[PDB]
Write a protein that binds this ligand. Sequence first.
Ligand SMILES: [Mg+2]
Ligand SMILES: [Mg+2]
Ligand SMILES: [Mg+2]
Ligand SMILES: [Mg+2]
Ligand SMILES: [Mg+2]
Ligand SMILES: [Mg+2]
Ligand SMILES: [Mg+2]
Ligand SMILES: [Mg+2]
Ligand SMILES: [Mg+2]
Ligand SMILES: [Mg+2]
Ligand SMILES: [Mg+2]
Ligand SMILES: [Mg+2]
Ligand SMILES: [Mg+2]
Ligand SMILES: [Mg+2]
Ligand SMILES: [Mg+2]
Ligand SMILES: [Mg+2]
Ligand SMILES: [Mg+2]
Ligand SMILES: [Mg+2]
Ligand SMILES: [Mg+2]
Ligand SMILES: [Mg+2]
Ligand SMILES: [Mg+2]
Ligand SMILES: [Mg+2]
Ligand SMILES: [Mg+2]
Ligand SMILES: [Mg+2]
Ligand SMILES: [Mg+2]
Ligand SMILES: [Mg+2]
Ligand SMILES: [Mg+2]
Ligand SMILES: [Mg+2]
Ligand SMILES: [Mg+2]
Ligand SMILES: [Mg+2]
Ligand SMILES: [Mg+2]
Ligand SMILES: [Mg+2]
Ligand SMILES: [Mg+2]
Ligand SMILES: [Mg+2]
Ligand SMILES: [Mg+2]
Ligand SMILES: [Mg+2]
Ligand SMILES: [Mg+2]
Ligand SMILES: [Mg+2]
Ligand SMILES: [Mg+2]
Ligand SMILES: [Mg+2]
Ligand SMILES: [Mg+2]
Ligand SMILES: [Mg+2]
Ligand SMILES: [Mg+2]
Ligand SMILES: [Mg+2]
Ligand SMILES: [Mg+2]
Ligand SMILES: [Mg+2]
Ligand SMILES: [Mg+2]
Ligand SMILES: [Mg+2]
Ligand SMILES: [Mg+2]
Ligand SMILES: [Mg+2]
Ligand SMILES: [Mg+2]
Lengths: 102, 100, 63, 146
Amino acid sequence: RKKGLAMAVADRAREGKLLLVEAFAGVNGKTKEFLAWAKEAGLDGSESVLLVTGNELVRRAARNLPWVVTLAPEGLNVYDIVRTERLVMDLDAWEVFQNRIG
Amino acid sequence: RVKMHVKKGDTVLVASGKYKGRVGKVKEVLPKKYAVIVEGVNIVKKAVRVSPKYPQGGFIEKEAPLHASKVRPICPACGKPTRVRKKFLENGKKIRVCAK
Amino acid sequence: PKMKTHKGAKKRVKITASGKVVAMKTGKRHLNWQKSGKEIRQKGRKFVLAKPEAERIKLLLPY
Amino acid sequence: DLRPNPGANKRRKRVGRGPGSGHGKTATRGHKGQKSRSGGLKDPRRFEGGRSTTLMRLPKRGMQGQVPGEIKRPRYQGVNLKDLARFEGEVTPELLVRAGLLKKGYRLKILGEGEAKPLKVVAHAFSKSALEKLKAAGGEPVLLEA
RNA sequence: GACCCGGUGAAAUUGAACUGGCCGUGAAGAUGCGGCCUACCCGUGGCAGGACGAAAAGACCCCGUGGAGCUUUACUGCAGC
RNA sequence: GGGAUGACCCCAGGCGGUAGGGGAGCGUUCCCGAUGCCGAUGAAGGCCGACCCGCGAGGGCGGCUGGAGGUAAGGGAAGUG
RNA sequence: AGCUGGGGCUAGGAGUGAAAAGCUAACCGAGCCCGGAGAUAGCUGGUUCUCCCCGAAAUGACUUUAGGGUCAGCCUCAGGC
RNA sequence: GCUGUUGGGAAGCAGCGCCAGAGAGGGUGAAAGCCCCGUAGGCGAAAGGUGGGGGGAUAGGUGAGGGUACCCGAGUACCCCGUGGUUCGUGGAGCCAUGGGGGAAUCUGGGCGGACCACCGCCUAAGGCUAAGUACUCCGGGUGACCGAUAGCGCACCAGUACCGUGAGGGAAAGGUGAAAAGAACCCCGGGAGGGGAGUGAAAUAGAGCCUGAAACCGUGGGCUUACAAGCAGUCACGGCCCCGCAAGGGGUUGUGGCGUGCCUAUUGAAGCAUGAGCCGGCGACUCACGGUCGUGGGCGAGCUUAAGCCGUUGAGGCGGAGGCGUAGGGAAACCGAGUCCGAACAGGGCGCAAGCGGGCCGCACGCGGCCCGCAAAGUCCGCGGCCGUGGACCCGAAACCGGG
RNA sequence: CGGGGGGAACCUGGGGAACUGAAACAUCUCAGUACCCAGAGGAGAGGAAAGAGAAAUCGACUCCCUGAGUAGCGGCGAGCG
Ligand SMILES: [Mg+2]
Ligand SMILES: [Mg+2]
Ligand SMILES: [Mg+2]
Ligand SMILES: [Mg+2]
Ligand SMILES: [Mg+2]
Ligand SMILES: [Mg+2]
Ligand SMILES: [Mg+2]
Ligand SMILES: [Mg+2]
Ligand SMILES: [Mg+2]
Ligand SMILES: [Mg+2]
Ligand SMILES: [Mg+2]
Ligand SMILES: [Mg+2]
Ligand SMILES: [Mg+2]
Ligand SMILES: [Mg+2]
Ligand SMILES: [Mg+2]
Ligand SMILES: [Mg+2]
Ligand SMILES: [Mg+2]
Ligand SMILES: [Mg+2]
Ligand SMILES: [Mg+2]
Ligand SMILES: [Mg+2]
Ligand SMILES: [Mg+2]
Ligand SMILES: [Mg+2]
Ligand SMILES: [Mg+2]
Ligand SMILES: [Mg+2]
Ligand SMILES: [Mg+2]
Ligand SMILES: [Mg+2]
Ligand SMILES: [Mg+2]
Ligand SMILES: [Mg+2]
Ligand SMILES: [Mg+2]
Ligand SMILES: [Mg+2]
Ligand SMILES: [Mg+2]
Ligand SMILES: [Mg+2]
Ligand SMILES: [Mg+2]
Ligand SMILES: [Mg+2]
Ligand SMILES: [Mg+2]
Ligand SMILES: [Mg+2]
Ligand SMILES: [Mg+2]
Ligand SMILES: [Mg+2]
Ligand SMILES: [Mg+2]
Ligand SMILES: [Mg+2]
Ligand SMILES: [Mg+2]
Ligand SMILES: [Mg+2]
Ligand SMILES: [Mg+2]
Ligand SMILES: [Mg+2]
Ligand SMILES: [Mg+2]
Ligand SMILES: [Mg+2]
Ligand SMILES: [Mg+2]
Ligand SMILES: [Mg+2]
Ligand SMILES: [Mg+2]
Ligand SMILES: [Mg+2]
Ligand SMILES: [Mg+2]
């Protein structure tokens, strides 16, 4: 379960479709806002994005977007990672991601 | 109760099909079928020639029910869905940048 | 559900480390008297072949 | 990676064995063809013939056990030197379980093959060859029982 | 009654059928294989030799370490005495 | 054997077959793929075909019917022929 | 030792029986219904798509065994020499 | 969220917009985030039930040394006889319960630690009560690699009904027009049922037990073909006729000649006068769980691995080392141990062990230090497949047996 | 003042089979299961040790996982555990 979890992120990384961030400028969970931020970040909606952050506000933000799969860091599974063209991760999520490896 | 809906005995528009764009008065609500009436849609009912009230003739019809989903209210403009205001004590329905 | 180990086997056989079934020689529990010393003496232990696979299957978990 | 082709490699073979068709396992059903092929036999393993199976062997392996049960007695578990070599300091039980061999198996008895090493070893029993090799530089914590 | 006409109209059985005879053959009793001999197509009334005709997984026989009813100084129990 | 491994060419053998052992596949229902894609310029299903591709189980293409659903390439389950 | 209406009692190893093992709701050497229950069946029957390779036995010993089994022999598949 | 267009009907397609804590799903004449019911989210009870979860309040209850020596559950303990339970089937048979007989004492008392004694130790019977965690699902709700009218409960429908049986009991079949009845006024044949026109409809071989409507089965028309043949009904080869096609070439039919012992099962052996099948459509038979043993795709390797459960999500996973298997084998065991067992035996003999590497690669030790290497040496865990064990274990089938009615 | 009767499963107690398995059968198994009866409830039972068992130990009862198919029981058979 460890390796698998790791090899997933790896692949996405190698392809160049990984992107850890911190700059969640789209404050208060409003789809509008998150849509603007995505536009300035390069997420038009032509690639499935697996948004994993521990910020419940950014959670509600997306979720309703057919091209976005919201998820908390503890629930980061490999299935979802493989069914989304792009991987955008919170920095706090990239923390527990390490800790959950040997 | 469990089957209340959008309109009642007032003016409505018909965004339906065959009679699209038509506008009519009180649509005699059913609603055990989710239909109305308006002044649109008519057909030709055979009506057997019996004496009761149709003494020899028969081929006149009324107004078709018309599925209530195909109508939309109209007031100080065109269509537009419906909103509800408190009335500071009672209860009434207003449009969206219009009224009742 | 969950095989049971055959108690009649464990009480009379033992499986070595190579996976060989071993048991006591038969024929000296009450014949003795007109049996040469050589007979009774030659009663130690012995193998078994073809029968130890059918045999070993009953000592499932005890290994 | 991607949805297409992540599939099992080489040998996955789920394809079980169905026996129904002119080609493969028709009629009889991929075996059988006689009678006493219906709900089972009696084993064979041990059973059948109507003979003596092979229950002729005697169990001189006496001491089956009395009704009260087995006797509670301290069991010893070996461990050659080859293992221990791995680490320095003072080896002791509990310290050996929280590592490789032993684990609650109760009473450590170091012994056998391998080279000794300058390090105290707390045990419960020691083979001859152990006391030997270890005399040539190394510990000896024995006795215990307290 | 059966037979003809008018009316209503079953059944078991049925691998499919374009279903002849004799010698012979064949798992040793042939419409169906072989050789030969007969023989235009389709029906109705009748006889029952055959289709090892129908019906009922032979009730006689044997096998099964099958069942059940009965007997006794077979075994082992039980009521009762 | 050529190597060029390109599953593409050569040489020489083998290929009757019940019980059984083994090896490849076809089709049916359902799941991920799916907030997708095909569909009223007509989905599933049905009736035809002398056409095409596979050794074959099958799969395509075309004509009529039909009138609202169907689901690839790659994989996963089983009330599967 | 008659027949008969109506009303009543006795039943499943039990009734009743001018005695046949008769009757006990059209089949009685132990009624019928439901359950244990999908009893058990070393027997009979049946067992569904395609192609490719190999390819048996009907023997011996023991068996309350003899139409059933365990081992060996004979087929096949993988690994090694 | 309007307009446009194809259309019988837009939600499809096109242009241009908008919401989203709401893009679950359903419905509207077809497929719609913005038409409708809803969903995210957020409110709400005069009355009745529930409710220490949060508050208080009652009832009840809490100590130390020294004396006396009064009390500490009776036909009871305890003993014997006959039994039941426990893994305990007379067994060395204790312990818990008790039908019979006998039958004590109150802490110097009395039972137990597997017959019985002796030390050591454990516990206070013959009075009673006590939540929570556990089991179940008539009822409500949510989900489904659950069925979709021969399936799924027996029942999607007026079903435990019609019907059988004295009774207990058994126990079915049977769903669909259309978006909307607009379900056919009137005319003709006819007694009617039925049709034929006409009319509604996008469609009427969608016309009312009406969606699609297959197969067996029964018709009408057309082509070919049969009244000197004979046969498991076919097949191969010529010929004639009729269709399609420009033509080489196909399709259909069969006149004559050749060749030809149905299918399945069971069998040494069947076309068999051995079994089974009237024909068609549909239901129908190697499964699942838990252990085991081989092979296999993987993870890690002197190690590998978690069970119950806790925390999360609401199709998200983490945590949890109690435990399991393997690293040592022998011996009945005491026991010893790379040895052990029989034996007096450093004779013998039975069981056991004696594994690295080609070496990735250079430090710029012209080493192998170590790391790397692949199963490995060597094993575990998961998946997958063959087979085995226990369960109905591939499916149908008894004559019978027992309990309650 | 209470009780009486009902309720799909689930609980306790009092009673309590045989087919089957042992490839026959009687000890044994199926099994204290099926079924009957009584009672209690949204749960029932059990429950403050005259306990366990070898540890200078634990500390009411109940439920899940291990212990463990161990120890043991057994025509030392099948099997129970
Ligand atoms: Mg989303
Ligand atoms: Mg709305
Ligand atoms: Mg299959
Ligand atoms: Mg089959
Ligand atoms: Mg075969
Ligand atoms: Mg057969
Ligand atoms: Mg035979
Ligand atoms: Mg059997
Ligand atoms: Mg007549
Ligand atoms: Mg003829
Ligand atoms: Mg003849
Ligand atoms: Mg002839
Ligand atoms: Mg005649
Ligand atoms: Mg006659
Ligand atoms: Mg017969
Ligand atoms: Mg062949
Ligand atoms: Mg389905
Ligand atoms: Mg389908
Ligand atoms: Mg099937
Ligand atoms: Mg009377
Ligand atoms: Mg009678
Ligand atoms: Mg009767
Ligand atoms: Mg039974
Ligand atoms: Mg051959
Ligand atoms: Mg023979
Ligand atoms: Mg429009
Ligand atoms: Mg739109
Ligand atoms: Mg006193
Ligand atoms: Mg007391
Ligand atoms: Mg007594
Ligand atoms: Mg006592
Ligand atoms: Mg005690
Ligand atoms: Mg039904
Ligand atoms: Mg009646
Ligand atoms: Mg139609
Ligand atoms: Mg329809
Ligand atoms: Mg004709
Ligand atoms: Mg002629
Ligand atoms: Mg012929
Ligand atoms: Mg014969
Ligand atoms: Mg044969
Ligand atoms: Mg025949
Ligand atoms: Mg015949
Ligand atoms: Mg026969
Ligand atoms: Mg017949
Ligand atoms: Mg049966
Ligand atoms: Mg019995
Ligand atoms: Mg019996
Ligand atoms: Mg028996
Ligand atoms: Mg309670
Ligand atoms: Mg028991």
